[PDB]
Amino acid sequence: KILHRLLQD
Amino acid sequence: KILHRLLQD
Amino acid sequence: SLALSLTADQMVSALLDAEPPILYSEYDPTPFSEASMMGLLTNLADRELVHMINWAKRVPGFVDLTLHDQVHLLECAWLEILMIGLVWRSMEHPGKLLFAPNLLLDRNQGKCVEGMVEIFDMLLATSSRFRMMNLQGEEFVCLKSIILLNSGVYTKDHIHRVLDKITDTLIHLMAKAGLTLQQQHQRLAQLLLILSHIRHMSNKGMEHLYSMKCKNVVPLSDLLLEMLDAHR
Amino acid sequence: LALSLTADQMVSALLDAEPPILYSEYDRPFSEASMMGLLTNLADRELVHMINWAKRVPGFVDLTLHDQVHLLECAWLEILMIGLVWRSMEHPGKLLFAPNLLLDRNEGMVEIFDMLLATSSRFRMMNLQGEEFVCLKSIILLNSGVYTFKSLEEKDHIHRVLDKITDTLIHLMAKAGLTLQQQHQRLAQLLLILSHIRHMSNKGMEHLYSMKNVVPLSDLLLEMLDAHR
Numbered sequence A, B: 001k002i003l004h005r006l007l008q009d
Numbered sequence C: 001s002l003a004l005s006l007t008a009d010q011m012v013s014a015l016l017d018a019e020p021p022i023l024y025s026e027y028d029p030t031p032f033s034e035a036s037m038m039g040l041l042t043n044l045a046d047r048e049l050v051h052m053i054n055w056a057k058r059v060p061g062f063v064d065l066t067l068h069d070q071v072h073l074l075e076c077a078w079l080e081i082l083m084i085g086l087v088w089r090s091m092e093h094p095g096k097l098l099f100a101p102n103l104l105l106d107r108n109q110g111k112c113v114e115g116m117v118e119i120f121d122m123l124l125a126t127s128s129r130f131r132m133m134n135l136q137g138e139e140f141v142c143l144k145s146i147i148l149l150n151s152g153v154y155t156k157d158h159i160h161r162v163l164d165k166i167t168d169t170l171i172h173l174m175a176k177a178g179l180t181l182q183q184q185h186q187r188l189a190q191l192l193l194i195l196s197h198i199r200h201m202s203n204k205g206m207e208h209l210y211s212m213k214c215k216n217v218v219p220l221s222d223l224l225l226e227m228l229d230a231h232r
Numbered sequence D: 001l002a003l004s005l006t007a008d009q010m011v012s013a014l015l016d017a018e019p020p021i022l023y024s025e026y027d028r029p030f031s032e033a034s035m036m037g038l039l040t041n042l043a044d045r046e047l048v049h050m051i052n053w054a055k056r057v058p059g060f061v062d063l064t065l066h067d068q069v070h071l072l073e074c075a076w077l078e079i080l081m082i083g084l085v086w087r088s089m090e091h092p093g094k095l096l097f098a099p100n101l102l103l104d105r106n107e108g109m110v111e112i113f114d115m116l117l118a119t120s121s122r123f124r125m126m127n128l129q130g131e132e133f134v135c136l137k138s139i140i141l142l143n144s145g146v147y148t149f150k151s152l153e154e155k156d157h158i159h160r161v162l163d164k165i166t167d168t169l170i171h172l173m174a175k176a177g178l179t180l181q182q183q184h185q186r187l188a189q190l191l192l193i194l195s196h197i198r199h200m201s202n203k204g205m206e207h208l209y210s211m212k213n214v215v216p217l218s219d220l221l222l223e224m225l226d227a228h229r
């Protein structure tokens, strides 16, 4: 999900 | 409404 | 008017004496289906509402309010009050919800109704939280009356004045049990933040109750429908 | 790391982490769908800053990615609402979604609008301070999804950080000259408002589920929608 990838950054 | 009656009784 | 003059012990004793009784479900159980289990729960909730209305009138300061304000507060908080009571009497039964002394249900039985397992796990988690915190009965009646006065106040200075006194009563109980100043305001915060989750569970339950009226399978009482209609 | 922060180190860390106030695309003819598009477009751009703000909140990075996702999926709308209510405090009877987007009271959205207005008037009446606002917002992030989490399960770490923020709120009120009784009462008043913020968020999710109709929604905003439904 997008929330996961944005938290990864 | 029924709530009126029970609050007054 | 009169509530503001009580002491902290007089407030505790007044709230304890106003506690509604633990009602019973309809006996001869027969496992449950979706229509039968929901009929037992809505029948129980309707009978508890009558006692809740009289319990609210015994909450100090609640009678000083206008009839319209008493109606509004109960219309907004009735499901939260049912839930915190269910959670309270389910404390000493981990993994099970004591709806009634003859109606103790676990998470498995919540799957008879679709979408009820989510509410069940939320209610079970709240009970475990209270059990972990070692919630006392004196603290419980304070939280329940706080729900009654706070849940509808935002949709009035006298109500907030009574809320401050129940807050003083909460701190007075924690200082009684020997809790330090740091432990008092930390436990106060923990208890009040749980009310946010109780509000969340009520909102989720209202949607189910609305979709339940739109099903017409399990009957709902006129009183229970009027409390529902106030949230639409 | 978060357990070593003093009360002033907690406030300074939360103040430095504050996201910016973004601007709307408001101009000129306005359909009810166009007004909503401006709000959903604004909320989507705010979500990107909230995600990076959350990583700056002490203790949030100590959590698993799964729990960080869960806390944000449950609290994102509450945090948008308390921020809107905060920056709308000095504007009685109006909601400041953006500096160029100041909306007054004048389908069903009026219920959400009046509730947000009442929250803003309640904050203004209490004379809510910025140091208190940043504490309440971080409490919402850590508390709104803690009750919806196997046994591996240090969620006592969240309650440890929650107790640290509670000590921070009390330290703030003690500096303002409030007696011990006034500190406890104000602390209770602030946290009871979070129940109404949860109520507004749940009613907002029901409206947002209805919109996912003609008004377009971003891909991130739709993922946050699927969490509550």
Ligand SMILES: C[C@]12CC[C@@H]3c4ccc(O)cc4CC[C@H]3[C@@H]1CC[C@@]2(O)C#Cc1ccc(N)cc1
Residues within 6 Å of the ligand: C038, C041, C042, C044, C045, C048, C082, C083, C085, C086, C099, C113, C114, C115, C116, C119, C204, C205, C206, C208, C209, C211, C212
């Ligand atoms: C109000 C409610 C039934 C009665 C319950 C009840 C009864 C008595 C009581 O002292 C407390 C409670 C608290 C929980 C209440 C349920 C929470 C779930 C519920 O809202 C329901 C339902 C429902 C769920 C799913 C579907 N499909 C339909 C209806």
